[PDB]
């Protein structure tokens, strides 16, 4: 279900330090990592419906 539901729950996605980010001198000890999500060719959706991500109060 396209909503928060105990019965149809997907599980947990977590990230960790296997070893540790190592850098030499004269270099920034802090950096940013960007993350992207997309669907595999086995992916599909059904039961067309109106979304809550947009509205017209008035």
């Amino acid at each position: 279900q396209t909503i928060d539901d105990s019965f149809t729950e997907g599980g947990y996605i977590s990230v960790f330090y296997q070893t540790r980010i190592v850098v030499p001198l004269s270099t920034p000890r802090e950096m940013d990592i960007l993350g992207f999500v997309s669907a595999c060719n086995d992916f599909s959706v059904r039961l067309l419906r109106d979304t809550t991500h947009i509205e017209q109060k008035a």
Partner: protein
């Protein structure tokens, strides 16, 4: 090639101009469509078209901008940005109608000790949001078209309050792609990422895109070139580093119709 050839090292040649690069992340061809001339089956204007070829279909280098910890992003519009570029701008202004593709080459080098990621995006019909909350679609022709120097994005939306004498210009907020939609999704659009640790630049080959076979290049801008810092510039320990972002662009398979006297726009 066991012979030497590689994805990172390219050589682009158009007319009398040639671009070389030893650190590229391959190249992108918008919607898998390589620029092309207007076909007879799809043609509209009946008059013999003007095809400048090498005189206009070459590489023009715009004014180099500076990337810093503070930078929120930069934007340009085509053909607007090339309007004053040699024979291409001349032919664009002398004709009622005109169509053109582009080879966009964004240059930005640094060092193995620098950090940062430039999100380079090619957006069809890149309509931007205005600076007014009392009125709409009010951004003036002069302000909507910065020419070669282009415009820039803001981390914050600050409404034009001078009702009497309106700034009549754009207020493009970075995280909203300057147009009411979330930046994180800008990737559905033809693009490339300039990740300092991986590559010097971004090469995008753009086709002529539009609801019409050919249109008014002076009244209408087909493509929008948006460059935003996905990951902020950062160096060794310097609190205020800096690196240049040079933008070189070349018109392609471009052609023009409806020839008459030169168009002298009110650009100020």
């Amino acid at each position: 090639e066991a012979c030497g050839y590689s994805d990172r090292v390219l050589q682009l040649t158009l007319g009398n101009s040639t671009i070389t690069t030893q650190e590229a992340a391959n190249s992108v061809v918008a919607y898998g469509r390589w620029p092309e001339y207007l076909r007879d089956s799809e043609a509209n204007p009946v008059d013999q078209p003007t095809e400048p070829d090498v005189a206009a279909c070459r590489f023009y280098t715009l004014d180099t901008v500076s990337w810093t910890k503070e930078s929120r992003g930069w934007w340009w519009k085509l053909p607007d940005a090339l309007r004053d570029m040699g024979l291409f701008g001349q032919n664009m202004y002398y004709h009622y109608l005109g169509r053109s593709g582009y080879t966009v080459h964004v240059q930005c080098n640094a060092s193995k000790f620098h950090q940062g990621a430039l999100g380079v995006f090619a957006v069809p019909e890149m309509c931007l949001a205005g600076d007014s909350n009392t009125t709409t679609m009010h951004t003036s022709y002069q302000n909507a078209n910065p020419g070669e120097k282009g415009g820039t994005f803001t981390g914050t939306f600050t409404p034009d309050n001078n009702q009497t004498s309106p700034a009549r210009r754009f207020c493009p907020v970075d995280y909203l792609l300057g147009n009411g939609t979330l930046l994180g999704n800008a990737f559905v659009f033809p693009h490339q990422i300039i990740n300092l640790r991986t590559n010097n630049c971004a090469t995008l080959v753009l086709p002529y895109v539009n609801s019409l076979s050919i249109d008014s290049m002076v009244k209408h801008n087909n493509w929008g070139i948006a460059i935003l810092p996905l990951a902020p510039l950062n160096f060794a320990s310097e609190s205020s580093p800096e690196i240049p972002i040079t933008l070189t662009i070349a018109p392609m398979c471009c052609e023009f119709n409806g020839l008459r006297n030169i168009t002298l726009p009110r650009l100020q």
